[PDB]
């Protein structure tokens, strides 16, 4: 029902912090309806030791206690990446961190679980839409996860990659 943040509605660049700048990257990309939106992409499958974070802007709570996070995203399919090493991955983690004000900076909070709280490891389900951008297939999955109770002025989300190839197409944060 009630939206706290929708990346799909951005009237300009996201502006989300990425750490390191070599990992996630803001890129224009498609909706499910082929509307062109801002997305974040990471695909450092040819590099060891990948730990790439992306963090939203401060989202106000506006009275909510339980937060729902709807993610649209596309994973590439390690099988479908020519010459890829065996360490390739097909999931990302989601985290939140609450705060009393917009306290985030380049180095705070630490870029790691604790102070961030892990919501879940996110993977592609077997429900989907797939189209031929021919002949490359665009497959968009949808996953919802929720967390709470949430009590402070607001919060941040984080998305962490550790050696896969994917695009986070949309994040919709809502309550009730």
């Amino acid at each position: 029902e009630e939206t706290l943040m929708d990346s799909t509605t951005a009237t300009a660049e996201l502006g989300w912090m990425v750490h390191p700048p070599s990992g996630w990257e803001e890129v224009s990309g498609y909706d499910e309806n082929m509307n062109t939106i801002r997305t974040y992409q990471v695909c450092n499958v040819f590099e060891s030791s990948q730990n790439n974070w992306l963090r939203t802007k401060f989202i106000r709570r506006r009275g909510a206690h339980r937060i729902h996070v709807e993610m649209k995203f596309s994973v590439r399919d390690c099988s479908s990446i020519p010459s890829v090493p065996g360490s390739c991955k097909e999931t990302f983690n989601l985290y939140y961190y609450e705060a009393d004000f917009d306290s985030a900076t380049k180095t705070f909070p630490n870029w790691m679980e604790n102070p961030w709280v892990k919501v879940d490891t996110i993977a592609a389900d077997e429900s989907f839409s797939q189209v031929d951008l021919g002949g490359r297939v665009m497959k968009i999955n949808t996953e919802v996860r929720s967390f709470g109770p949430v009590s402070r002025s607001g919060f941040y989300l984080a998305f962490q990659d550790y050696g896969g190839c994917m695009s986070l197409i949309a994040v919709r944060v809502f309550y009730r």
């Binding site: 070599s22 992409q41 695909c43 450092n44 499958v45 040819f46 590099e47 596309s74 994973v75 590439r76 399919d77 479908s80 990446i81 890829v84 951008l133 490359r136 297939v137 665009m138 497959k139 190839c165 994917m166 695009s167």
Partner: peptide
Amino acid sequence: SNEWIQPRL
């Protein structure tokens, strides 16, 4: 399969 997502180098 999402073959439009280019690796980095």
